[PDB]
Design an enzyme around this catalytic site. Structure first.
Site, PDB file in Angstrom:
ATOM      1  N   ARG B  72       0.917  -1.196  -0.058  1.00 34.11           N
ATOM      2  CA  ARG B  72      -0.031   0.063   0.201  1.00 34.11           C
ATOM      3  C   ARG B  72       1.139   1.247   0.129  1.00 34.11           C
ATOM      4  NH1 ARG B  72      -2.920  -3.412   3.823  1.00 34.11           N
ATOM      5  NH2 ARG B  72      -2.254  -2.094   5.608  1.00 34.11           N
ATOM      6  N   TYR B  93       9.909 -11.542  10.800  1.00 29.64           N
ATOM      7  CA  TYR B  93      11.110 -12.436  10.728  1.00 29.64           C
ATOM      8  C   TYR B  93      11.035 -13.566  11.468  1.00 29.64           C
ATOM      9  CZ  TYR B  93      16.304 -13.875   9.738  1.00 29.64           C
ATOM     10  OH  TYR B  93      17.331 -14.268   9.374  1.00 29.64           O
ATOM     11  N   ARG B 146      14.237 -26.381   2.585  1.00 31.48           N
ATOM     12  CA  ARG B 146      14.568 -26.328   3.810  1.00 31.48           C
ATOM     13  C   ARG B 146      14.179 -24.846   4.569  1.00 31.48           C
ATOM     14  NH1 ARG B 146      16.675 -23.508   6.866  1.00 31.48           N
ATOM     15  NH2 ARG B 146      18.969 -23.337   6.532  1.00 31.48           N
ATOM     16  N   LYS B 164      13.647 -11.830   4.208  1.00 32.91           N
ATOM     17  CA  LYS B 164      15.110 -11.264   4.078  1.00 32.91           C
ATOM     18  C   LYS B 164      15.450  -9.976   3.364  1.00 32.91           C
ATOM     19  CE  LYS B 164      16.728 -15.160   5.882  1.00 32.91           C
ATOM     20  NZ  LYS B 164      17.886 -15.384   6.782  1.00 32.91           N
ATOM     21  N   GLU B 236      19.023 -19.215   0.018  1.00 36.48           N
ATOM     22  CA  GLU B 236      18.486 -19.257   1.083  1.00 36.48           C
ATOM     23  C   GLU B 236      17.229 -20.347   0.957  1.00 36.48           C
ATOM     24  OE1 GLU B 236      18.466 -17.959   4.776  1.00 36.48           O
ATOM     25  OE2 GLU B 236      18.769 -16.342   3.559  1.00 36.48           O
ATOM     26  N   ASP B 237      17.574 -21.208   1.995  1.00 41.73           N
ATOM     27  CA  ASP B 237      16.769 -22.237   2.499  1.00 41.73           C
ATOM     28  C   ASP B 237      16.705 -23.392   1.435  1.00 41.73           C
ATOM     29  OD1 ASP B 237      17.061 -20.753   4.701  1.00 41.73           O
ATOM     30  OD2 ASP B 237      14.743 -20.583   5.019  1.00 41.73           O
ATOM     31  N   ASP B 259      23.383 -18.113   2.636  1.00 39.68           N
ATOM     32  CA  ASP B 259      23.110 -17.433   3.770  1.00 39.68           C
ATOM     33  C   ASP B 259      23.258 -18.308   4.909  1.00 39.68           C
ATOM     34  OD1 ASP B 259      22.599 -15.229   5.752  1.00 39.68           O
ATOM     35  OD2 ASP B 259      20.321 -15.618   5.450  1.00 39.68           O
ATOM     36  N   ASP B 260      22.721 -19.552   4.645  1.00 36.50           N
ATOM     37  CA  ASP B 260      22.481 -20.687   5.721  1.00 36.50           C
ATOM     38  C   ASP B 260      23.714 -21.165   5.922  1.00 36.50           C
ATOM     39  OD1 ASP B 260      19.356 -20.426   5.553  1.00 36.50           O
ATOM     40  OD2 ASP B 260      19.803 -20.824   3.683  1.00 36.50           O
ATOM     41  N   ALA B 296      24.296 -25.249   8.283  1.00 42.81           N
ATOM     42  CA  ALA B 296      24.938 -24.354   9.272  1.00 42.81           C
ATOM     43  C   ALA B 296      25.981 -24.907  10.142  1.00 42.81           C
ATOM     44  CB  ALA B 296      23.708 -23.997  10.194  1.00 42.81           C
ATOM     45  N   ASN B 402      15.692 -22.635  14.157  1.00 42.45           N
ATOM     46  CA  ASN B 402      14.585 -21.811  13.972  1.00 42.45           C
ATOM     47  C   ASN B 402      13.477 -22.715  13.353  1.00 42.45           C
ATOM     48  OD1 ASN B 402      16.093 -19.565  14.881  1.00 42.45           O
ATOM     49  ND2 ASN B 402      16.939 -19.558  12.945  1.00 42.45           N
TER      50      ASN B 402
HETATM   51  N1  LIG Z   1      20.191 -19.164  13.601  1.00 36.49           N
HETATM   52  C1  LIG Z   1      20.356 -19.297  12.257  1.00 36.49           C
HETATM   53  O1  LIG Z   1      20.977 -18.052  11.570  1.00 36.49           O
HETATM   54  C2  LIG Z   1      20.372 -20.320  11.276  1.00 36.49           C
HETATM   55  C3  LIG Z   1      20.957 -20.464  10.036  1.00 36.49           C
HETATM   56  C4  LIG Z   1      20.781 -21.440   9.242  1.00 36.49           C
HETATM   57  C5  LIG Z   1      19.999 -22.615   9.862  1.00 36.49           C
HETATM   58  N2  LIG Z   1      19.244 -22.548  11.195  1.00 36.49           N
HETATM   59  C6  LIG Z   1      18.575 -23.552  11.460  1.00 36.49           C
HETATM   60  O2  LIG Z   1      19.202 -25.085  11.606  1.00 36.49           O
HETATM   61  C7  LIG Z   1      18.672 -26.109  11.543  1.00 36.49           C
HETATM   62  C8  LIG Z   1      19.221 -26.909  10.398  1.00 36.49           C
HETATM   63  O3  LIG Z   1      19.696 -26.043   9.454  1.00 36.49           O
HETATM   64  P1  LIG Z   1      20.678 -26.642   8.237  1.00 36.49           P
HETATM   65  O4  LIG Z   1      20.497 -25.955   6.910  1.00 36.49           O
HETATM   66  O5  LIG Z   1      21.802 -26.927   8.745  1.00 36.49           O
HETATM   67  O6  LIG Z   1      19.870 -28.125   7.894  1.00 36.49           O
HETATM   68  P2  LIG Z   1      20.348 -29.326   7.097  1.00 36.49           P
HETATM   69  O7  LIG Z   1      19.303 -30.099   6.320  1.00 36.49           O
HETATM   70  O8  LIG Z   1      21.640 -28.841   6.356  1.00 36.49           O
HETATM   71  O9  LIG Z   1      20.912 -30.371   8.074  1.00 36.49           O
HETATM   72  C9  LIG Z   1      20.455 -30.611   9.728  1.00 36.49           C
HETATM   73  C10 LIG Z   1      21.493 -31.591  10.152  1.00 36.49           C
HETATM   74  O10 LIG Z   1      20.698 -31.768  11.601  1.00 36.49           O
HETATM   75  C11 LIG Z   1      20.678 -33.373  11.703  1.00 36.49           C
HETATM   76  N3  LIG Z   1      19.547 -33.700  12.561  1.00 36.49           N
HETATM   77  C12 LIG Z   1      18.298 -33.811  12.181  1.00 36.49           C
HETATM   78  N4  LIG Z   1      17.634 -34.298  13.209  1.00 36.49           N
HETATM   79  C13 LIG Z   1      18.471 -34.630  14.247  1.00 36.49           C
HETATM   80  C14 LIG Z   1      18.328 -35.409  15.588  1.00 36.49           C
HETATM   81  N5  LIG Z   1      17.183 -35.689  16.038  1.00 36.49           N
HETATM   82  N6  LIG Z   1      19.400 -35.366  16.184  1.00 36.49           N
HETATM   83  C15 LIG Z   1      20.594 -34.946  15.939  1.00 36.49           C
HETATM   84  N7  LIG Z   1      20.872 -34.396  14.410  1.00 36.49           N
HETATM   85  C16 LIG Z   1      19.930 -34.193  13.747  1.00 36.49           C
HETATM   86  C17 LIG Z   1      20.797 -33.874  10.421  1.00 36.49           C
HETATM   87  O11 LIG Z   1      21.299 -35.116  10.133  1.00 36.49           O
HETATM   88  C18 LIG Z   1      21.722 -32.665   9.645  1.00 36.49           C
HETATM   89  O12 LIG Z   1      22.990 -33.002   9.688  1.00 36.49           O
HETATM   90  C19 LIG Z   1      17.082 -25.335  10.798  1.00 36.49           C
HETATM   91  O13 LIG Z   1      16.355 -25.242  11.950  1.00 36.49           O
HETATM   92  C20 LIG Z   1      17.589 -23.964  10.452  1.00 36.49           C
HETATM   93  O14 LIG Z   1      16.354 -23.113  10.859  1.00 36.49           O
HETATM   94  C21 LIG Z   1      19.606 -21.435  11.840  1.00 36.49           C
HETATM   95  O1  LIG Z   2      -1.678   5.638   7.258  1.00 36.11           O
HETATM   96  C1  LIG Z   2      -1.627   5.611   6.217  1.00 36.11           C
HETATM   97  O2  LIG Z   2      -1.720   6.635   5.392  1.00 36.11           O
HETATM   98  C2  LIG Z   2      -1.667   4.046   5.547  1.00 36.11           C
HETATM   99  C3  LIG Z   2      -1.889   3.185   6.337  1.00 36.11           C
HETATM  100  C4  LIG Z   2      -1.830   1.581   5.708  1.00 36.11           C
HETATM  101  O3  LIG Z   2      -1.834   1.572   4.414  1.00 36.11           O
HETATM  102  O4  LIG Z   2      -2.129   0.712   6.443  1.00 36.11           O
HETATM  103  O1  LIG Z   3      15.964 -17.178   8.015  1.00 40.08           O
HETATM  104  C1  LIG Z   3      16.669 -17.494   9.109  1.00 40.08           C
HETATM  105  O2  LIG Z   3      16.396 -17.089  10.200  1.00 40.08           O
HETATM  106  C2  LIG Z   3      17.774 -18.688   8.826  1.00 40.08           C
HETATM  107  O3  LIG Z   3      18.269 -18.656   7.578  1.00 40.08           O
HETATM  108  C3  LIG Z   3      17.278 -19.971   8.825  1.00 40.08           C
HETATM  109  O4  LIG Z   3      17.355 -20.821   7.867  1.00 40.08           O
HETATM  110  O5  LIG Z   3      17.004 -20.407  10.018  1.00 40.08           O
HETATM  111 MG   LIG Z   4      17.199 -19.667   6.075  1.00 38.30          MG
END
Ligand SMILES: NC(=O)c1ccc[n+]([C@@H]2O[C@H](COP(=O)([O-])OP(=O)(O)OC[C@H]3O[C@@H](n4cnc5c(N)ncnc54)[C@H](O)[C@@H]3O)[C@@H](O)[C@H]2O)c1
Ligand SMILES: O=C(O)/C=C/C(=O)O
Ligand SMILES: O=C([O-])C(O)C(=O)[O-]
Ligand SMILES: [Mg+2]
Ligand SMILES: NC(=O)c1ccc[n+]([C@@H]2O[C@H](COP(=O)([O-])OP(=O)(O)OC[C@H]3O[C@@H](n4cnc5c(N)ncnc54)[C@H](O)[C@@H]3O)[C@@H](O)[C@H]2O)c1
Ligand SMILES: NC(=O)c1ccc[n+]([C@@H]2O[C@H](COP(=O)([O-])OP(=O)(O)OC[C@H]3O[C@@H](n4cnc5c(N)ncnc54)[C@H](O)[C@@H]3O)[C@@H](O)[C@H]2O)c1
Ligand SMILES: NC(=O)c1ccc[n+]([C@@H]2O[C@H](COP(=O)([O-])OP(=O)(O)OC[C@H]3O[C@@H](n4cnc5c(N)ncnc54)[C@H](O)[C@@H]3O)[C@@H](O)[C@H]2O)c1
Ligand SMILES: NC(=O)c1ccc[n+]([C@@H]2O[C@H](COP(=O)([O-])OP(=O)(O)OC[C@H]3O[C@@H](n4cnc5c(N)ncnc54)[C@H](O)[C@@H]3O)[C@@H](O)[C@H]2O)c1
Ligand SMILES: NC(=O)c1ccc[n+]([C@@H]2O[C@H](COP(=O)([O-])OP(=O)(O)OC[C@H]3O[C@@H](n4cnc5c(N)ncnc54)[C@H](O)[C@@H]3O)[C@@H](O)[C@H]2O)c1
Ligand SMILES: O=C(O)/C=C/C(=O)O
Ligand SMILES: O=C(O)/C=C/C(=O)O
Ligand SMILES: O=C([O-])C(O)C(=O)[O-]
Ligand SMILES: O=C([O-])C(O)C(=O)[O-]
Ligand SMILES: [Mg+2]
Ligand SMILES: [Mg+2]
EC number: 1.1.1.38
Lengths: 552, 553, 553
Positions: B72, B93, B146, B164, B236-237, B259-260, B296, B402
């Site tokens: 809007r 987020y 993911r 993002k 991402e993901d 990013d992950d 990660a 997360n």
């Molecule tokens: N905080 C951050 O900035 C951030 C960034 C990226 C990912 N993450 C989070 O981390 C988590 C995983 O991300 P990823 O990209 O590494 O996933 P991924 O798919 O690359 O891998 C997940 C890993 O965890 C393992 N796993 C799964 N279940 C399990 C269990 N019960 N016990 C032990 N190990 C287990 C898997 O075998 C694998 O090694 C997600 O929840 C994601 O949201 C957080």
């Molecule tokens: O206050 C405004 O002008 C707009 C609000 C909205 O689009 O939610």
């Molecule tokens: O989006 C996030 O916060 C992060 O990249 C994740 O995958 O968990």
């Molecule tokens: Mg992510």
């Protein structure tokens, strides 16, 4: 359509959302701008109904529904068509009143056209900024009497918007033909003048000649651009302004006041339903009004008209109508003022003069009471009992809006008179079940039953002026739809669920009347008036936007 | 200057000011009458928003409302976010974005990015040419496999790129009209979503043939062909298999990071370095156990190795300090469960007892730092935490999974069960924890939101063509170097989210100084003041004048 | 008010003012810098045009130039025409329009109307919806089969509708944006044009099947479906067979006339009535011989009959005074050459000697008036004219065929060979003729340009639904009633072309008074002053202000 690409999605008139076909996406450069999924309207309507069930407050429902109008216009009217009985209380009275009361707090996008007293002399330039070229219908307010809520100023814009939603939803009048207008000349609502979110000028209502001259300019500006037969419906103007504008313009422009004339039409239609049950003699009719303003004098004048049409004199009819306003019963020589429209219904004082409205029920012993004061629950339990005491089948019309300003409830009416009363309300009440298991479904005596059907007819007939007698025919055509089953349940109007069908049939009958009385200037005169009106209704079904590729 | 006037200026959220359109603007641009006579400031609009929000209950209702503003009035949207980013970060987020993606199709009103399906194949160019913005500098892309710890959400995952890039603008002042969220739809293996009638992707199972690689290739080419070969593409993901092989395939061929892997590597490290400042644990005695061996896990481990290597240690004896425990148990040489290339350097000779649970892995390996990145729920059990409080005087506990539900543990049970001795970071936000003895611990959020904005801004402004793992090492240094003593003294291992704007800009500044120093910047000329250069090119949420230039002769 | 700003205001000839865009207009509408700093009046632009023209030689070079203006600056175009319509009528209208149509494809720069081909069949609606103007009130349509006396020119004939509608605006002040020139392309039988690589129509022979009638039907429906059932449709240059059967088929079903039948009927009659004023020849003694029995011949004859009938005579004894001589010779009962329905009333019992030449037809029938509408060249030979000067003291000689080459004779040889006794009118313009004895005769132009503008304006403003033959009778009366004594005294049987604007408006006024009096007008309400009503609704060539309305509060 002349535009392509993203603009089709930003324009809610054209936006189909995911219901843009694969061809439409590719040929008009939408591909990738929409998710790969291709939906039907039926899927969108479903998504909407799923989300609506999770919502609690009516205002939250209003913000959602009215939001869709500014995102996907077709889908907006589809979900309204899907269950208008459900959604009428949300998009219309009473919730629209709540919406208006805090319009500035829920604001997201403007809706309709704003003409301010600061724009005097430049109203054409403003009218010329409205993007649509073929406007046929205008609903205008200055916000001074928004329902029974009083002077809400520019917050009043919510009412014209709601009215023109129902033009389309009920009559299938084209949305892009519809122009909601707010006249801002200030507000006397002190609460709003210190509201930092108020959407109008921070001034008290200008009541100088500049006011009258501004409304003149608005009238000239609209017809100059759009056509001299452009339908201008006046809504929720102040009492004084409502009348003098209706008379000053009704011969010069294609105008009417919904609150005077539209109300009159729906009220009578209700009284004509009541009279079909009661079947009492037209000589034993004493009608008492709580309130002597737009709705009161309007209804009164159209009762007189059908009484004059159905038997007795014009002077005989006026003595049968009585009026009780803020100051006391309307009686000749009373200290409080009487305007010229109140003269015919002001009578020489009876034996004892009432102090309260209950005393006026006992003294006059009326067969029908009608409430249009917007002053709250003045049809007190005593007033209702006394009315059931005096009459075997009393008629109680609590028409004031919204619900809080209503004179009494459907339950209060059907209970205290032991299911004898014939009842209609302005705001919607649900079915009432009494102790002995009798279910009473109250009808809604609201001008929503009229203004759509009337408006469509006046438009499709290219009619130039609207006499009181057009509202007589609509009154007749509304009650002429009420079935015996629907009246056996206590409805003085057809069910709100069929208001589409009702409003179309009203337009057809008012079309036939306008042609037969040399008021239609749409040459040629059509043979089948039914099929004429029915094939000209706007539909919520998505159109094709594909160019015509072919052959050679 | 704008090319369009009349109603279109209000229908376009990039240009719509609502009632903040000045009288002059309304009259010259044909808006007079289309707006209420009221003229408003952004301050009044901002105030209208906050009163409306105080007043909603469910986080998802707030998400639908705030994200509605973006379609809007874009200026007002970012003004809103800027007013109180810490308040609204949970809503726009993690975690509320997860809730939003889980039913993205049930709350759909408008599309919010570019959709490239496997059906749209060989025609990706024409779809990229349908995006109305001409100067895109930043793409965030997902295939939805993911989405957080919620796994395969398909097109419902589009919510994540949108989130993002809102933060690109909100944190780093990267221009929104230069931002392009993308969703690659190749189907989903999520059977729940294939049965949902509101699903927004193709009703098909995830295509894993050559055509998947051929589509991502065509996407990379289509984007860079239109917008430039140095167009920032943030992955991402995407899910373990694809994240890594795409990062490697493209990191030297395009201006692209994951990013992950790399973002979360930089924030994790910045957290670990802040922990080092209070513990001062000798480098030799450090031992890090990962719950998870995924994107990660392996990303964070590679940046720890590089930091240790820079501080004296060798590659081999740095990797020896990192253990990982995946879904099949600990990772040791010659196990039934597989070991991929990236996991090999961290797969060590089996200890005395091979643990079956993660708690056993703690009691055996006796690690000093524990990092959870499994997305598998509350696996850092009270007994896992207690064991850490026993083994370590100051245990480091990073529960980074997360959203909130999938986190390894809460702040509450970290600070409580370690008697306020632990150094804790979450991936999803937790409030301050007050213990019975009166001490109040304010947990920091180890989330890649602290990295990807600043890094992205630097890369864009420096016209950088390829991002080295070393840029993320500098990002981590830049981030932790802004953590004040007083903030570290209340338990924060990161600067507060309230200051993420200036933190993000300071990261960007430090990363530009680095990129120039190491001849990675291709923006001529090199500016003298790198701080002034970055700061003067940030997008502002303040309305621009749209008035034609009218003047006398 | 305009919906668009910037360069588009200059690319659109409807809105382009060139350097007459005011400073304020340039600055507010984003034209500053796109125009030279010079600000001009239309007077300066007009003056630039005239100096350029004085100064070209060939009429076709002038046509390409003036008609070029219409596609650059429409206001200036009509200003130019208005400045001196008599000068430029030969250039934009007969004869130079004929020269232009004869090579329309060799001089093509832009299209100037709507093209509906026989291939475009069943899809005429979508083509009518491609016309960018929403309020069309006036269509002039041709199939190109009878372009002037040049016969079948196909799509090259489009030049004629364009010319006609320029004169709608130039003469009657009918709004150009409400004007739609149309060309129906069903192929051409002109073999020269089928061999020309620059031809603008389908390369096929004229389709004469049912599909031709089905296409014209679909056109009539498509036009009226979009623009209104009372949309004025003027049929122009369709060719004998089609002109008549389409006029009759549609005259009571649509708001449609044929200009080559009814328009030329009205101007011819107006010429004959002006002749009656100087001769005063008793009605009984009138005898009119037509060279041609085509559209114009039969149209003019039917309006003469109606005028005679109104003045006392019966239908039968009025028709007995009209003879016609076509390509096969005189028209008499039971001849080898055919006699169609419309020709029957004028086909009489053969005289004593059946003439073989037209000169013989003069010497036998001894007619008082001679009307040439054959488009067959100089058939009113010196011996034809002499015979008329002998038989008649004041011979009436109307050589109406167009263009100039196809005219039956010049003014020069009419006034000379009758010793300045003839009453003469041409279809194509001739200059004043000075005879040896010093008398100077100024010939009037019997051309339907004197009728179709005024009639068209009246019909439009009165919202008239069907045009009776009686409207053209009133047009003829209205036209001749403006001829002053002094103009009739120099040999003019029509008011001068210099005054065609006010003549055309006065016709319109008189025709509206008639249409209202005879309940043919459907514009509510009936205005009191019909002169004021017409005059105040004429389009003006003066630039409009395009300034946004800017004012203080
Ligand atoms: N905080 C951050 O900035 C951030 C960034 C990226 C990912 N993450 C989070 O981390 C988590 C995983 O991300 P990823 O990209 O590494 O996933 P991924 O798919 O690359 O891998 C997940 C890993 O965890 C393992 N796993 C799964 N279940 C399990 C269990 N019960 N016990 C032990 N190990 C287990 C898997 O075998 C694998 O090694 C997600 O929840 C994601 O949201 C957080
Ligand atoms: O206050 C405004 O002008 C707009 C609000 C909205 O689009 O939610
Ligand atoms: O989006 C996030 O916060 C992060 O990249 C994740 O995958 O968990
Ligand atoms: Mg992510
Ligand atoms: N149901 C419908 O279709 C419909 C249509 C129009 C108006 N209305 C409702 O009718 C009510 C008034 O409408 P209006 O346009 O006539 O307003 P108005 O100002 O024209 O009339 C108000 C009248 O009621 C009188 N009144 C006010 N308070 C009173 C009291 N306590 N006791 C006695 N009399 C009192 C006033 O003196 C005045 O005569 C509003 O609630 C309005 O929403 C309903
Ligand atoms: N006084 C000032 O504030 C000031 C002074 C100088 C330049 N500028 C700004 O710098 C820009 C000059 O651009 P240039 O073409 O010389 O490139 P540049 O050298 O300034 O910028 C380098 C690259 O980063 C991009 N970029 C810059 N700011 C960005 C943002 N907020 N979001 C996304 N991308 C961004 C540019 O498009 C370019 O590709 C102008 O738009 C101007 O507003 C401002
Ligand atoms: N509005 C304009 O300025 C404009 C422009 C071009 C063409 N037209 C008209 O288009 C017409 C073709 O159909 P029509 O309009 O005559 O049908 P019609 O004559 O049966 O319609 C009667 C009137 O009602 C209006 N109307 C019809 N359906 C409507 C609906 N669903 N909602 C609201 N108003 C409606 C029409 O605009 C018209 O004024 C032509 O007669 C022509 O005059 C109008
Ligand atoms: N001045 C005007 O306003 C005006 C209006 C319409 C037509 N015209 C002109 O009149 C001419 C014909 O128009 P039309 O529509 O009647 O054409 P048409 O096709 O209807 O008929 C032409 C007639 O002339 C006859 N003819 C042809 N050659 C002949 C010859 N050598 N001798 C005798 N008769 C001959 C034909 O047989 C036919 O009867 C054209 O030159 C046209 O430009 C002038
Ligand atoms: N002071 C003045 O000069 C004055 C006064 C009154 C009206 N007007 C003009 O009359 C128009 C009002 O239109 P209305 O809808 O009431 O119809 P109308 O009743 O004025 O006109 C009748 C019909 O003729 C058409 N028409 C009028 N002028 C035309 C032209 N120059 N060319 C082609 N068609 C024309 C109209 O569109 C309409 O269909 C306005 O555009 C206005 O400019 C001018
Ligand atoms: O489902 C849609 O397409 C639109 C929904 C909305 O606007 O809420
Ligand atoms: O502009 C021209 O002169 C020609 C254009 C064309 O032949 O298309
Ligand atoms: O809107 C309404 O219901 C009515 O017109 C009123 O004013 O009460
Ligand atoms: O255009 C004309 O001058 C006339 O209509 C003709 O056909 O000769
Ligand atoms: Mg009302
Ligand atoms: Mg012609």
């Amino acid at each position: 359509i002349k535009e392509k690409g993203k603009p089709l999605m930003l324009n809610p008139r054209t936006n189909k959302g995911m219901a843009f076909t694969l061809q439409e996406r590719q040929m008009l450069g939408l591909q990738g701008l929409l998710p790969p999924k291709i939906e039907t309207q039926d899927i969108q309507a479903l998504r909407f109904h799923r989300n609506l069930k999770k919502m609690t407050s009516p205002l939250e429902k209003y913000i959602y529904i009215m939001g869709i109008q500014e995102r996907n216009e077709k889908l907006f009217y589809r979900i309204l068509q899907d269950d208008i009985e459900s959604l009428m209380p949300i998009v219309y009275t009473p919730t629209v009143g709540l919406a208006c009361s805090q319009y500035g707090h829920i604001f997201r996008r403007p809706k309709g056209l704003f003409i301010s007293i600061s724009d005097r002399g430049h109203v054409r330039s403003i009218v010329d900024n409205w993007p649509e070229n073929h406007v046929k219908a205008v609903v205008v307010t200055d916000g001074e009497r928004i329902l029974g809520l009083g002077d809400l100023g520019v917050y009043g814009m919510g009412i014209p918007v709601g009215k023109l939603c129902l033009y389309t939803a009920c009559a299938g009048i084209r949305p892009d033909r519809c122009l909601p207008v707010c006249i801002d000349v200030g507000t006397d609502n002190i609460a709003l003048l210190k509201d930092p979110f108020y959407m109008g000028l921070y001034q008290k209502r200008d009541r100088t000649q500049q006011y009258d001259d501004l409304i003149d300019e608005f009238m000239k500006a609209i017809t100059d651009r759009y056509g001299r037969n452009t339908l201008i419906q006046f809504e929720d103007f102040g009492n004084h302004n409502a009348f003098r504008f209706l008379r000053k313009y009704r011969e010069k422009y294609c105008t009417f006041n919904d609150d005077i004339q539209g109300t009159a039409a729906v009220a009578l239609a209700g009284l004509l339903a009541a009279q079909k049950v009661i079947s009492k003699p037209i000589s034993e009719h004493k009608i008492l009004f709580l309130g002597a303003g737009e709705a009161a004098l309007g209804i009164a004048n159209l009762i007189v008209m059908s009484m004059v049409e159905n038997g007795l004199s014009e002077q005989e009819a006026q003595k049968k109508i009585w009026m009780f306003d803020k100051y006391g019963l309307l009686v000749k020589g009373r200290k409080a003022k009487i305007d010229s429209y109140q003269e015919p219904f002001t009578h020489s004082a009876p034996e004892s003069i009432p102090d309260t409205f209950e005393d006026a029920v006992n003294i006059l012993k009326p067969s029908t009471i009608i409430g249009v004061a917007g002053a709250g629950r003045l049809f007190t339990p005593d007033v209702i009992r006394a009315m059931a005491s005096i009459n075997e089948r009393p008629v109680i019309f609590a028409l004031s809006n919204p619900t809080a300003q209503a004179e009494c409830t459907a339950e209060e009416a059907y209970t205290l008179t032991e299911g004898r009363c014939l009842f209609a309300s302005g705001s919607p009440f649900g079915p009432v079940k009494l102790t002995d298991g009798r279910v009473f479904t109250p009808g809604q005596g609201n001008n929503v039953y009229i203004f759509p059907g009337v408006a469509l007819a006046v438009i499709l007939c290219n009619t130039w002026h609207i006499s009181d007698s057009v509202f007589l025919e609509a009154a007749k055509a509304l009650t002429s739809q009420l079935t015996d089953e629907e009246l056996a349940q206590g409805r003085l109007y057809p069910p709100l669920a069929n208001i589409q069908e009702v409003s179309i049939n009203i337009a057809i009958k008012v079309t036939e009347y306008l042609y037969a009385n040399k008021m239609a200037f749409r040459y040629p005169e059509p043979e089948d008036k039914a099929k004429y009106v029915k094939e000209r209704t706007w539909r919520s079904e998505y159109d094709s936007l594909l160019p015509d590729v072919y052959e050679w």
